[PDB]
Design a binder for these strands. Structure first.
Lengths: 71, 71, 71, 71, 71, 71, 71, 71, 71, 71, 71, 71
DNA sequence: CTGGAGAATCCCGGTGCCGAGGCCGCTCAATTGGTCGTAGACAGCTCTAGCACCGCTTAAACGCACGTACGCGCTGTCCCCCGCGTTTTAACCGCCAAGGGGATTACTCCCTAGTCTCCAGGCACGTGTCAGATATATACATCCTGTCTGGAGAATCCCGGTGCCGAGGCCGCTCAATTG
DNA sequence: CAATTGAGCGGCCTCGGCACCGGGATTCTCCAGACAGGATGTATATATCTGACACGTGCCTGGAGACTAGGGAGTAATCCCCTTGGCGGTTAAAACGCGGGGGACAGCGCGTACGTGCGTTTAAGCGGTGCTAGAGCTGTCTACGACCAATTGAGCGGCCTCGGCACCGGGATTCTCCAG
C-alpha cells in the first residue's frame, strides 16, 4: 500500500514495533511508522549521494552513509 | 543477514538509496543504512509504546507514533 | 531582570551554584544559569502539555512531567 | 516544601508550566518539575565550578556555565 | 464573518491560539489567524488538485495533499 | 476524529479543497489537509504568543499573528 | 571547473550573459551564474522526479517538468 | 536543436535530471527543462547587466549576478 | 493606528480611494489599503538600499528607487 | 509638492526608506518613491471600486481591496 | 575584499575554520564562509529590528536578537 | 571581550545590525549577535573539515563549505 | 421588496508632525595614474549529437469492487448579546546607557619566496551489475472476540480570592579576586 | 607585581510566594456496545543467492599551483569621557476580552447506489546502448582597456528651529448594507 509514501514491507515495520514491546499494533500505526522511516531514510540517502559525488565517485559507500547520518 | 542489527529487507533499503539518486550502491552501504534505519525506528517505537500505555491502552495507534516522532 | 529569558529568582539560582561548591559567583553567571534552566524547563513543560492532552486531559500531572523528561 | 529536592519557588515553576500551555496544573506536577530542574541545574553547576577552578579562578563566570551546559 | 477570507470557525481558530499558550486572545487576532490559515490552505489545495489531475484522477487523495505540502 | 492531530471541522476542510477545484475528495485527503493546517497553524500561534509576551502583554493581537507569519 | 557546483559549460553560460547585453563578462560572474542555474535546475528536477513516480512512472516527461516549474 | 529557446547542451540538462534521481528521461523533458533554465537565466542576466551599468561599469561581476538573483 | 503595519496617514489613503471613484469608504478598507501600500513600499525600499550600497554609496538616490521598482 | 503625482506626505515616505536601512536619503528619491506608491495605489483602488460596484455596493470594503491586490 | 558580500575580517573567519580542526584552508573557502555568515547574520538582524520596533523601541537589545534567532 | 564566545570584531557585528535598519544598538545585543554567529559558524566549519578529510584532503575548499552549509 | 441597525458622513476642536529656511560638513563625482584581468586568436583533445537496433515501459481496454456522493437524521456546536474588570494605552519624570567625539594601539591585508600537496594520467584488482531459479515470507481474505470508546455519576482536588509574613532585589561601601 | 573591577556583606523595605477555606468541574470508575486487531490459512511475487562479466576505484607517479611563514605599513577596532535621548516605571481611565446564557444551524453520521480508481493484459511507442565524426569547449599567451585607489571641490543632506496646516477624534444622524 502507498508504495511512494511507505517504502518497506508492512510485516517488517510491524515486527519492529512489537519487539519495541507493543502488546497490540494498529494497521494505521504500521503505515505511519513506515512513512516516518521512509521520509527520514530518503533525507539521509539524498545527502550521502551528494557526499559520494563530491568525493569524485559514482558508488555510495559505508563511509558516505555514516557521514550523512552524523549531519 | 544480521537480522537483529538490520530489520528491513536489503533489496528495499537498496531501492531507497537508488531513488535518492545513486548511480551504484555498495553492499556495505545497504547494510549500514539498514542498521541506521533500524536503530532510529527502534527508538521511536519504544517511546510510542510508553505513550500508548500512559494513555491507558494496549494498542499502539497512529497518534502515539506521530507524538513519539515529534519528541 | 529579563523576566522572559530567566523565569526563576536570581537569589535561588545563585544559592544553587554556591551549594554546587562555588567560592564566588558572578552576576552574569547567575543570569546565564537562569536562562539555561528556563530554556530547558520550557522544552520539558511544552512536551508534557502535549502528553496530557493526548491522554485526554486538561491537567498536567506528575506522570506527564516524568514521561516528558525521559524523552 | 522539600527544599533540598526542589530549590525554586513553586509559584514560579507553576507559571512556567502554564505558559507552556497548561489549562490546569497538579501540585504534584509542580513538585516533580521543581525536582527535575533542581537535579539538572545541580549537575551543570557542579561541572562549571570544576571548569572555573581548572581555569585558576575562585569565581564562576558566564563562560564556565556556557561550557558546562555544552558538555 | 468574512466567509471568503476566513474559511474556518472562529471558535476553533481561538482554541488553537489558546493551546499554543495564549493567556488572552483578541478577536482581530482570531480573524487574522483564520485568514492566514485560509490563504495557505488554498495554495496547497489548488496545487494538490493539479497533481490529482496530472495523475489521471478526479479524486484528491492523501498522497496528493502530502506531495503538494512538500513543494 | 483525531482531535489533537486535526483541529478544524472536516466539513470545512473538505469545502476548502472543493473550492480549490476538486471534482471529488477522499476522506483521507480531508484528514491529511486538516493535519497539515493544524501543524502549521500551531507553529505560527506558538511564535505569536512569544512575541505578545516579549512585547509585555498577556493578549495575542493581530500584529503579533502578522509578525509571526512573516518569520 | 567545480563540476558539482556548476553543471553547464562555462562558454554557454558566458554566451547567455553576453546576449543579455553584457559589454564584458568576468570569469567569476560566469561561475556564479553557472552555480545559480545549477542549484535552481536541481530543485525543479528533484520535484519533477517525485511527480513522475507519484504518477506511477519511471520516465520523467515534459508535463512533469512543466508542473514542477509551476510550483 | 531550437538554439534560441534552449541555450545549454541537451546531454548536460539530461545529466542534471538523472542525478536528481530519474530512472529514465524523455527527450521532450530534456527540451522543456533546457527552455525553463534558459528563460530563467535570461531574466537574471538581463537584470545583472542593468546593475553593472547603474554601478558605472561595462563588466558584469559576481556581485551583480548575486544581487540580481536575490531580487 | 497600527503604526508598524500602516505607515501612512489614514486621511491620505482615504483621499486616494475616493479619487479612484469611491462613493463611500469603510475604515477597514482604509486600514487594509494602508497595510498593502506599506508592505509593497518596504519591499522596494529594502532593495533600493542594497542597490545604493552595491553602487558604493550611503545615500539612496532617485535612480536606485527607479531600478528597484523595475525588478 | 506635486500633489497629483505624489499623494503621501514626504516625511512619511522618507521614514519608510530610512527604516528599510538607508544611511542617507536624497529628496529626489523621496519624490520618486512617493510617485511609485501613488501610481500603484491608484491602480489597486480603481480596480477595488469596480469590484465594490459589481458586488452591488457604493462602499469600498476590506475584502474588495484584498481581492483587487491579488489580481 | 567584496565588503558587501563578506562583512567580517578574513583573518577572523580563517581562525574560526582552523579551530574547527582544519590542517590547511583555501582563500576561496575563507571567502565562502564569510559570505555564508554574512547572509545568515543579515537575516537574523533584519528580523530582530522588526521585533524591536513592534515592541515600541528604537534600540535593538539582547532579547530581540535571542527571539529572532529562535524563529 | 569573551574571545572564545564571540570570534568576530564587535565593530563589524554592530555595522551588520545597523545596516539591517537599527536606529540604535545595545552593547549586549552586539555581544549576543557575535556569540550566535560564532556558534553557528563553528558548527558549519567542523562539518566542512570532516567533508574535506572524507574527500582525502588536508585543505578545506569552497565546495566543502558549500556542502556543509546545505546540510 | 421589505425591516432593522451598523457604521460612514459631515461637522467642529485642538494639537502634533509635516514643511520650509538657514547653516554646516560629510559625501558623491571627476580626474589621474597603474594594474588587474579581460578579449582575441590559435591547437587539439573532448564530449557532444546523430543514426541504427533491441525491448522495457507505456498507454488503452475493460471488468470487479472500493469508497465516494446525495439525502436525511439528530444534537453538539459556534456565533451573538449583555454585564462586568482587567489589561492596555497614553501622559510625565527621572536615570541608564547609546551616541559622538579624539587618540593609540593591535591586528589586519598585501607582497614576498619556498614547497607541500591537490590534480591528472595510466595502470591492475575489486566488486557492483545484470540475468536466472528457488522458495519463503509477504499481503489479502475470513471468522472471532478483546479492546477502545462512550456515557453517566461520584468526589477529588485545582482554581480562585484571602491576609501577612518572608525573602528577593536594590544601594552603598569595601577590599578581595582578576586581568595585564 | 600593580591597580583596577566587580562580588561580598551589610541594612530597609517592597513585591509576591505561601498556607487556608469554598466551590466546582475535571477525572476516574463502572458497565454496554461494536470497532478492528489477532490468529489461521493460501497463493505468489518478492528477496536472496549464483555466477560471469567489465566498469569503477584505488594505487603510484609527476608537475604546477596555491597555501604557509615571515615582514611591514596602515588602519579601523577599542577604550575612555561626555551628553542627552529614550527606555522604563507610575499612574489614571477608557477598551475590549472573559464569562454566562440561548438558540438554531451545520457538522457528523448512517445507508444506499453507482461511479471510478485499481488491476490484468496488448500492442507499439520510444528511451537506452552502442558506435562514429567532428565542431565545440577548453587552455595559452598577448596586450591594452577599464577597473580600482587616492585625491580634490562643491553640493546637497542633516541638523536644528518656527509656525500653521491638516490629521485624528469625537458626536449626532441617516444612509445603506445585511437578513430574511
Amino acid at each position: 500500500s502507498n508504495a511512494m509514501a511507505g517504502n518497506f514491507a508492512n510485516a517488517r515495520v510491524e515486527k519492529l514495533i512489537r519487539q519495541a514491546g507493543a502488546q497490540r499494533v494498529s494497521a494505521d500505526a504500521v503505515d505511519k511508522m513506515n512513512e516516518i522511516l521512509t521520509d527520514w531514510g530518503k533525507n539521509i540517502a539524498k545527502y550521502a549521494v551528494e557526499i559520494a559525488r563530491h568525493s569524485g565517485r559514482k558508488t555510495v559507500k559505508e563511509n558516505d552513509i555514516k557521514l550523512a547520518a552524523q549531519k
